[PDB]
Design a protein around this ligand. Structure first.
Ligand SMILES: CCCCCCCCCCCCCC(=O)CSCCNC(=O)CCNC(=O)[C@H](O)C(C)(C)COP(=O)(O)OP(=O)(O)OC[C@H]1O[C@@H](n2cnc3c(N)ncnc32)[C@H](O)[C@@H]1OP(=O)(O)O
Ligand SMILES: COc1cccc(CC(=N)NC(=O)c2ccccc2OC2CCNCC2)c1
Ligand SMILES: [Cl-]
Ligand SMILES: [Mg+2]
Length: 385
């Protein structure tokens, strides 16, 4: 593996390893003045297109592109299916720029064939808070793959981010690239055991018959934290303090403003669910997860896998095991087939006791133009969508 594009970028080489005492950009003293003002060149017959994610039809174009062409599991049985409403929520956070929502259309058909996006946030890395772009939803149409279009998207968004005097980015991928700061396996907790078997997500054996697997995964419809309820506006100050205080321990975390806590946590049906425990006017516990269905490719019975992805979970009145058991319950009450989590923060500590299964791969975390020590994923305290 040669990394002919990645080698030219301010990111570590495959073999670089830095001490905890290094925590700085690869390239500093950057000047907005010097950034190229011209758009990167596309191949003949393709054009940059500014996507207006707040316009239903533009948002729908992105939706269709990703639905057809976005990330599949290692075996090509599932494809991520972010909803249009999810996209809206994901891309219009506080201080977002419409111009970091970058499509490429094929001129002859006026069809969107490429996409990349970023939103700005404060990122704390080894106790240094830096303004960064959070990049996501890079996608080239399946019929246009391995044509070196992705580097053009990446260079173009880097240029536009740099124009705002931002010089660092954070991103995740399942692929290995120069060079992860941390690497987090994913795990799955079955809710609807029978569906998961029928679609090949999960497995049975002579010792685990269907009826026993169903019994293994059954959950009691009663919360450990009795008063856990959907978050409301009035809980924003309390979540900001609970979640903020919690995150300061990790090597890698977003430093949320109150405005960002409202945007990121206030519940939206089929998008984001946040539950809180309020005691004496204080928010003492919180659970949150987001909805990311997967399209099931060619299963005769089921087209969609409804899945909850653990976002941020904090307890002060219960055990973390108890809190995450409540999170599984709340996901079941909301019709999800499965609860997914990565081995970040304290999550790994509860996976065995709560009957999570190890998945088949891992999610790599990346920083652009930042040089530091890598670390085990328990020290990661940010979950990207
Ligand atoms: C200061 C601001 C900085 C901002 C920018 C920050 C950086 C953000 C960077 C992006 C973060 C996005 C995070 C995110 O969205 C979440 S990760 C999931 C990304 N999307 C998908 O996997 C969807 C399915 N695949 C596709 O649409 C295509 O396969 C893509 C578009 C992935 C590559 O299209 P292609 O037709 O398969 O390939 P070529 O055009 O020929 O290009 C090949 C080159 O691209 C490198 N490549 C492959 N996958 C990559 C990936 N996931 N990140 C970065 N680079 C990736 C690859 O190593 C090679 O470079 P090399 O030759 O050096 O190896
Ligand atoms: C079940 O259907 C699919 C479809 C496509 C790919 C995969 C495997 C996967 N790569 N999972 C995660 O990345 C993952 C697992 C647990 C928690 C978070 C995960 O990734 C999130 C979604 C994509 N971007 C980063 C967060 C499964
Ligand atoms: Cl209850
Ligand atoms: Mg390409």
């Amino acid at each position: 593996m040669d990394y002919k594009f990645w080698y030219t970028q301010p990111v570590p080489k495959i073999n670089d390893e830095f001490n905890e005492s290094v925590n700085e950009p690869f390239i500093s003293d950057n000047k907005v003045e010097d950034v190229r003002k011209d758009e990167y060149k596309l191949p003949p017959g393709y054009s940059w297109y500014v996507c207006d994610v707040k316009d239903e039809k533009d948002r729908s174009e992105i939706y269709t592109l990703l639905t057809d062409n976005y990330v599949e599991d290692d075996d090509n049985i599932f494809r991520f299916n972010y909803s249009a409403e999810f996209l809206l929520w994901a891309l219009t956070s506080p201080n977002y720029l419409k111009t970091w929502h970058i499509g490429v259309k094929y001129d002859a058909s006026n069809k969107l064939i490429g996409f990349i996006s970023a939103i700005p946030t404060d990122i704390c890395i080894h106790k240094r808070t830096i303004k960064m772009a959070e990049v996501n939803f890079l996608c080239v149409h399946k019929t246009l793959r391995s044509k070196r279009l992705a580097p053009v998207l990446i260079k173009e968004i880097t240029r536009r981010i740099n124009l705002e005097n931002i010089w660092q980015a954070i991103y995740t991928a399942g692929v290995y690239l120069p060079k992860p700061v941390s690497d987090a396996r994913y795990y799955h907790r079955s809710i609807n055991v029978k569906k998961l078997i029928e679609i090949g997500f999960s497995s049975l054996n002579s010792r685990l018959t269907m009826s026993r697997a169903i019994k293994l995964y059954r959950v009691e419809d009663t919360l450990n934290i009795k008063n856990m309820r959907l978050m409301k506006k009035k809980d924003v100050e309390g979540v900001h303090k609970l979640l903020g205080s919690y995150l300061e321990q990790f090597n890698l975390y977003a430093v949320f403003t109150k405005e960002e806590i409202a945007h990121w946590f206030l519940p939206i049906e089929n998008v984001i669910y946040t539950y809180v425990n309020e005691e004496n006017g204080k928010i003492k516990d919180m659970i949150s997860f987001y909805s990311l269905p997967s399209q099931i490719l060619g299963n005769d019975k089921y087209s969609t896998l409804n899945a909850a992805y653990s976002f941020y979970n904090v307890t002060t009145t219960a055990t973390f095991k108890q809190l995450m058991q409540d999170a599984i319950l709340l996901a079941k009450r909301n019709n999800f087939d499965v609860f997914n989590a990565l081995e970040v923060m304290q999550n790994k500590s509860v996976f065995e006791d709560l009957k999570f299964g190890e998945g088949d791969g891992s999610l790599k975390y990346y920083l652009y133009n930042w040089k530091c020590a890598s670390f085990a994923p328990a020290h990661v305290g940010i979950v990207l969508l």
